[PDB]
């Protein structure tokens, strides 16, 4: 590189030649992905359309759900325990619609997901057991995201993808037979303000809304009156970026760009 | 929303009709507001002119002060305990000047406010008892905001406004006779770099400055030589956005926008 | 400031006369600086060319390394204890090339640096012993920075530089004979997306790359094939800003701008 | 006291005259008591007989149950959420048998009860709201007690009885209208190895076993084969101390004896 | 048990018939045991003679070492990382002398073992994978035991033996293919003041001492001048209880006795 | 010791010759001691007469007070900050009567003293600065001691006296010029149920009661009506053990007996 003349030239050579980065078809070779959600419903709301397209292409999609959804009701006669048991069933039914056959429930309490080594170890045991080719999680840099379970899921997902590759990290996994997580897998962040890869979900939008409504405890009619237009407006926001009606947006970067990189806004 | 043509129209309808968002007169209907401050003096510094305006208009303003200002001196003759007691009296005088009669002191130690469910439960107990129409708090996304008590108070306030509405959150409150928070019409964030509502305080600026200086332990003459110009320049930065000499800046968004929203920069 | 007419004027006078803010020779008169790094290798990667220039000028540069680099290997036969001991000797060799004669090792475990009062106390005790004229640390607001040890080192460095000046903070230090940290000193943040000060390291770039590669455990040939072009590109991003081939970028602000300031993007 | 000749004389004068202590009929005047249990079933197993006798004497008995019992099954098809909802109903049915009409569920997860200020604040809000005349909890000094929820419930119960009297402790309770907890109430510790007050439960034993078996999720037939003889042997252990067939044991001391006291073994 | 006359008879039947407790030959049937130590060297110090006896009898003994022994030197030339690596090799040699081939190193830092659910999950993962017949651990009730790593390891081991049997505890273990712990027949506590089973090690004492001294960083000659007499006197204290020169003492109780039991002193 | 014949012999030689343990004049040669108290008033209540005797002998006695006594009032008009500042002056007056000229205030909040590494670091830094010949602290094994600040002060004092001697513990202390705590020094535990050393305070009892009552905020007349007889009775419990009317009791053991020792009750 010592002979390239300008930063602009170096950036393009680094991104395309050295890091081999392009977003033409980033999920192309995937056989198994994890979709990590803060609460029951986040995978389908954030990326339901893409989940169905992945299942249709013969990719095995597996959820990891960080919390139980215990707090998500204003009904005073429904305890958190009873809601959590109801929402496990809602998510099973929603997942069947999208082709998902396996969900890891971590069972942290809703509004209480910790931000700790302990939670990275839980994600790391699943990464190491399943060895996915790709991991989806919320973008923890989304502006004004006020829910701590969402920010923490996104930070702990990215951290655990990196650290789970390290054999001195949670080393008792390796002592019981698991290998470090394989290198070469992608991360794609949903619920992002800065998507650089859009999936067109226009003909899948009605199925995605149906699979969201199956979470009935969350979406009774009065709430749906505000949420349906909200969810459609979000999908148009992403779809407009590639000139289709409804889209799901993801942010994808080279691994090196998640650290010390001062020009992440160029992609 | 199935029929709408473009994202731009869906966004406009979402805001004006579905969410009925209006920045013309957001504090129009308030009768009781909480002003949440990290330290003794932040309510008057960030929003003292607006507090006066509100109290003058018949609005009951009630302070919640998260910490005791124990660390706020370079005077080696003044212990933290003695400074805290001094600052309680400074805040009482300062508040009297604006029209404020009630202060909840949570008494966390300055520089040590936790980011935790315990602190959410304290805010939640106050929200359920007082049932305010509005809540004001620092914007935890202010760039370069290096005081963890400021960032934490902002996140905790937004979080508690949300979760105090959920009956399974901090449930022992309901068990002792409190009801879920269900009065608020708004959150407004002060100390913000992205205000979208500006209150003109140009004729109240002298009183604001007087009410800040009531905090004498914080503003001896030598410190005031820097702070008076800084505070004036801040008030000019905000006032200039609506073409007035001195202003106070707030950011206000629809409740939905604090979660999963990728177009928050459009307001 | 009561009579100044525009925000733009007020701002220019606040910086240049009230705060005497200087981006022309910010490191002039520095006799002793601390360079706070999350891991062994971060001071040289982020700012090695500047550390050499400071050393060449007769400035005493002292490192504070937050963690031990225990996790930084994918070799299943190298334990973290063994890798930590390797990395300590690699940092000693790297530091000697750049003229650095002292390193404070805090010895927190890599990937496990706490965000706590305790860690501020450790920094504060060094600040009070050494009384440096300036401190360098990572910018904890770097977008997409996904290493918690980086974000937490930046926050805790900026917090400790402020709180170590307060006699009621970590008061047992003063009880054992240390004085509060002196008030004259700068902070400069490296690993930043918003530099406002660039040091030309075009001549020094090969010395920097050499001193980085002395951390051999971190940079075997396959990793260096990606990291050398990456580090050159980052240096060209900064260099271009002052018309030179390779630079190191820092963000420097007056102390007041690290709190409640809505116009930090104007510098 | 300065004229008493021997320690033995002083101890007896202190205990009987100064502290007015005797265990002739310690629950005699009680109108309202709290029975604080670590898990659903502990009140009935530890003190079911006495609870029924208190209800029969017209005392209002109120449970506080610290945890949800989420972990207490070996059935792999029953989630913790579903078990917790089942055990809420078991405890309601068990309590009806004993005359208990009110239970405060704190909702901490089984095996996860924290030992923290936060949990003392929850107990303190209930003490301050209910103003009981007496509080029962597990003796946290029971030798070989291996369950951390049991030790922590006993320590946090004693602590919260003391601290809830202090108006600077959890002061926001007082700001919303609650008074400090009234002085003069007793504490009695059950599950104790050093009882000094025994309640004869001989004719209540069959009712107590019935009210224990209503917790069916805990006591299927195979478990009951070991637990019935266990529970009978425990009751004989306590009953033998006063010469009856089945007893429930409590340890009761003067308040001063819970602190700095080197002769607690004399009672 | 309805018919039994006296507590004494109920106690005897409970122990011998209901609980089938026998201290004649408690390690009779073991094929695989875990020896859980706080630090490198505690298994050989507390129970090295018994470990040899077990390995000689065909029993597979597997160490779990909670911490890395990082603090265990007064040699200012030896960093914590270098000492840990030295102690791993000392333990491997020491273990080879007894018949031990496998060591799980959890790698918590010496003096810093947490008391937490995270540590329980590590022990739990090992218990579910190895399914040992017995577990040995320090007695956390040893009086005057001032090392928190010793108290914590004892409590955590007893707790994890229990909770690892519950499918909702650490559930992601089951999800990755592990089964609940359901093999153990026993816990035995060493380092105990209340042993009720004594192994004669009189002919193994020389080898025990040799295997302890293999930990050379811990036992240079000057320290050995005190430790050899202390270790010999300990072995005499235990051996004397069964009339032998040198012994090792264990406390063993029925599983029920670790909970709510008020007569644990009767064994 | 290979040839010694009975345990009893081995023990007597271990104490008297190997450990040179002396209960005859344990405080002889002490030039400087630290007296570690949980709250303002505990050094004088537990050991005020001994502190006077040490002072009279020309020993430099230095207090370390862990907490600020913020919670110790039932007066609803006295804030904790105001009470802390009162108690600091009450301790200064009390200490002057007993010849104490220096107090380290750690300023943790009463009822909130952490049990952590951080608090050990604070004690360690004082131990290393002052290098005392002996340390006094409460016995954290006192039965029924229900104040967490008492139990945690005792544990952390004993832990810090041991760990402050290790150069890898809190190593930044040595980096700033402090040496490891010297190895010659005693621990003596007050507030103990198992004293083995008693100081006769019969002459000093009125001075002790006076110096306790200088803590007026703690001892108004109604409280003193119970506390004076209680403190006299405690002193008579200790005194009787050496045939005097009033004493202070301490538990003193060789360093080794605070770890792994099953016969601590033999002294
Ligand atoms: Na693959
Ligand atoms: Na200087
Ligand atoms: Na009453
Ligand atoms: Na000395
Ligand atoms: Zn969610
Ligand atoms: Zn503030
Ligand atoms: Zn780094
Ligand atoms: Zn229980
Ligand atoms: Zn050990
Ligand atoms: Zn005390």
Q: Do E122 and A175 touch (CB under 8 A)?
A: no
* Bridge partners (DSSP) listed for residue E136: E35, E188
Residue tagged 């936060």 (tokens): D118
Structure token pair of residue C88: 């300590």
Look at residues E191, E186, E199 and name the one whose alpha carbon lies nearest to residue E52: E199
In whole angstroms, what is the distance from residue E61 CA to residue E55 CA? 7
C166 and chain B in contact, CB less than 8 A: yes
Nearest ligand, measured from the Cα of A154: 5
Each residue of E117-128: b (16+ CB within 10 Å) or e?
Answer: bbbbbbbbbbbb
Protein residues placing their CB within 5 Å of the ion ligand 8:
D 38-39, 42
In whole angstroms, what is the distance from residue C143 CA to residue A250 CA? 16
Which helix (H) or strand (E) segment holds residue A103: the answer is strand A102-108
* Bridge partners (DSSP) listed for residue B1: none
Q: Provide, for chain E, the percentages of residues in helix, strand and coil under a 3-state DSSP scheme, each rounded to the nearest 5.
A: 45, 15, 40
CA D243 – ligand 4 centroid, Å: 60
Please say whether the beta carbons of E246 and E202 come within 8 A: yes
Calculate the alpha carbon distances from B76 to B71, B226, B250, C2, C177 in Å. 11, 22, 37, 33, 13
In whole angstroms, what is the distance from residue F138 CA to residue F155 CA? 8
DSSP state, E245?
S
Residue tagged 């200490």 (tokens): F95
In whole angstroms, what is the distance from residue B215 CA to residue D171 CA? 24
Which of D81, D104, D107 to mutate against chain A (most A CBs within 10 Å)?
Answer: D81
Look at residues A167, A135, A169 and name the one whose alpha carbon lies nearest to residue A154: A135
In whole angstroms, what is the distance from residue E18 CA to residue D227 CA? 9
Residue E193 among known ligand-binding residues: no
Question: Closest partner residue to B71 among C163, C257, C264, by Cβ?
Answer: C163
Please say whether the beta carbons of E49 and E204 come within 8 A: yes
Calculate the alpha carbon distances from C17 to B219, B238, C183 in Å. 20, 22, 18
CB atoms within 10 A of CB A239: 23
Calculate the alpha carbon distances from D9 to A169, D17, E239, F192, F232 in Å. 64, 11, 43, 21, 12
In whole angstroms, what is the distance from residue A124 CA to residue D255 CA? 50
Cβ-count burial of A138 within 10 angstroms (0-12 exposed, 13-18 middle, 19+ buried)? buried
Residue of E nearest to F161 (CA): E146
Cβ-count burial of E35 within 10 angstroms (0-12 exposed, 13-18 middle, 19+ buried)? buried
Q: Do B229 and C159 touch (CB under 8 A)?
A: no
Q: Which residues contact C190 (CB under 8 A, 6 or more apart)?
A: C46, C47, C136, C137, C138, C139, C248, C249, C250
In whole angstroms, what is the distance from residue D191 CA to residue E41 CA? 37
C264 and chain B in contact, CB less than 8 A: yes
Q: Transcribe D146-214 into DSSP letters.
A: --HHHHHHHHHHHHHHHHTT-TTTTTHHHHTTPPPPPSS-EEEEES-SS-SEEEE-GGGHHHHHHHHHT
Look at residues A147, F230, D41, C154 and name the one whose alpha carbon lies nearest to residue B161: A147
**Domains in chain C and their CATH numbers?**
1-267 (3.40.50.10320)
Q: Do E230 and F18 touch (CB under 8 A)?
A: yes
Structure token pair of residue E234: 């300990």
Q: Given in angstroms, what resolution was this structure solved at?
A: 1.5
Q: Do F260 and E76 touch (CB under 8 A)?
A: no
Which of E210, E236, E245 to mutate against chain F (most F CBs within 10 Å)?
Answer: E236
Residue of D nearest to F47 (CA): D260
Residue of A nearest to B161 (CA): A146
Look at residues D35, D36, D29 and name the one whose alpha carbon lies nearest to residue D58: D29
Which helix (H) or strand (E) segment holds residue E247: the answer is strand E247-250
**In this complex, which chains have at least 3 CB pairs below 8 Å with chain C?**
A, B, E, F
CB atoms within 10 A of CB C9: 13
Structure token pair of residue C129: 């012993």
DSSP state, A29?
T
Q: Where are the beta strands (DSSP E) in chain B?
A: 32-37, 60-67, 102-108, 134-138, 186-190, 197-200, 247-250
Angle (nearest 5°) at CA A119 between A117 and A124: 90
Residue of C nearest to E83 (CA): C81
Residue of A nearest to E119 (CA): A118
Please say whether the beta carbons of A239 and A200 come within 8 A: yes
Calculate the alpha carbon distances from B134 to A230, B185, C260, E170 in Å. 24, 6, 22, 42
Which of C77, C81, C83 to mutate against chain E (most E CBs within 10 Å)?
Answer: C81
Angle (nearest 5°) at CA C14 between C12 and C19: 120
Phi-psi region of C265 (alpha: psi -120 to 50; beta: other; left: phi over 0): alpha
**In this complex, which chains have at least 3 CB pairs below 8 Å with chain D?**
A, B, E, F
Please say whether the beta carbons of A139 and A193 come within 8 A: yes
Structure token pair of residue A149: 């379970």
Which of E63, E68, E102, E118 to mutate against chain A (most A CBs within 10 Å)?
Answer: E118
- Is A touching F (3+ C-beta pairs, cut-off 8 A)? no
Q: Which of residues 173-202 of C touch A (CB under 8 A)?
A: 191-193, 195
Protein residues placing their CB within 5 Å of the ion ligand 2:
C 133
Residue E39 among known ligand-binding residues: yes
First to last CA, chain A: 21
Please say whether the beta carbons of B173 and B123 come within 8 A: no
Q: Which residues contact B57 (CB under 8 A, 6 or more apart)?
A: none
CA distance B105 to chain D (A): 8
Phi/psi for C22 (5° steps) reads -125, 110
CA F67 – ligand 9 centroid, Å: 30
Q: Do F68 and B85 touch (CB under 8 A)?
A: no
Look at residues D214, D224, D158, D160 and name the one whose alpha carbon lies nearest to residue D190: D158
In whole angstroms, what is the distance from residue D234 CA to residue E260 CA? 9
Residue B5 among known ligand-binding residues: no
For CA atoms F237, F238, F241, F247, give the dihedral sign.
negative
State whether residue F200 is helix, strand or coil: strand
Residue tagged 């030798």 (tokens): D143
Structure token pair of residue C46: 């982020």
Cβ-count burial of D177 within 10 angstroms (0-12 exposed, 13-18 middle, 19+ buried)? exposed
Helices and strands counted in chain F (H then E): 8, 7
D239 and chain E in contact, CB less than 8 A: yes
C88 and chain E in contact, CB less than 8 A: yes
Q: Provide, for chain F, the percentages of residues in helix, strand and coil under a 3-state DSSP scheme, each rounded to the nearest 5.
A: 45, 15, 40
Angle subtended by helix axes A221-240 and A205-213, to nearest 10: 150
Residue of D nearest to B178 (CA): D176
In whole angstroms, what is the distance from residue F196 CA to residue B100 CA? 61
DSSP state, E16?
I
In whole angstroms, what is the distance from residue F238 CA to residue F139 CA? 15
Q: Do E68 and C81 touch (CB under 8 A)?
A: yes
In whole angstroms, what is the distance from residue A72 CA to residue B32 CA? 27
DSSP state, B194?
S
* Bridge partners (DSSP) listed for residue D64: D36, D104
Q: Which residues contact D222 (CB under 8 A, 6 or more apart)?
A: none
């Amino acid at each position: 590189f010592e002979d390239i003349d300008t930063f602009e030239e170096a950036f393009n050579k680094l991104l395309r030649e050295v890091l081999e980065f392009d977003l033409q078809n980033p999920f192309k070779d995937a056989k198994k992905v994890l979709c990590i959600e803060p609460h029951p419903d986040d995978c389908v709301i954030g990326m339901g359309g893409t989940i169905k397209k992945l299942s249709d292409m013969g990719v095995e999609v597996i959820y990891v759900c960080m919390t139980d959804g215990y707090m998500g009701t204003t009904d005073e006669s429904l305890s958190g325990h009873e809601l959590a048991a109801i929402r496990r069933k809602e998510e099973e039914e929603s997942a069947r619609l999208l082709g998902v056959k396996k969900i890891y429930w971590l069972n942290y309490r809703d509004t209480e997901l910790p931000y700790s080594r302990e939670v990275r170890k839980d994600l790391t045991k699943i990464l190491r057991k399943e060895q996915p080719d790709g991991v989806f999680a919320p973008d923890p840099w989304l502006p004004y995201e006020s829910h701590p379970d969402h920010r923490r899921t996104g930070f702990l997902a990215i951290e655990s993808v990196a650290f789970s590759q390290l054999p001195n990290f949670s080393n008792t996994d390796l002592d019981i037979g698991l290998n470090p997580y394989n290198s070469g897998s992608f991360i794609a962040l949903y619920y992002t303000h800065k998507p650089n890869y859009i999936v067109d979900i226009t003909d899948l939008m009605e199925l995605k809304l149906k699979a969201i409504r199956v979470h009935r405890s969350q979406f009774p009619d009065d709430i749906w009156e505000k949420w349906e237009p909200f969810l459609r407006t979000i999908a148009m926001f992403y779809g407009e970026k590639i000139g289709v009606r409804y889209g799901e947006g993801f942010r994808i970067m080279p691994g090196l760009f998640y650290h010390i990189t001062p020009f992440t806004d160029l992609i």
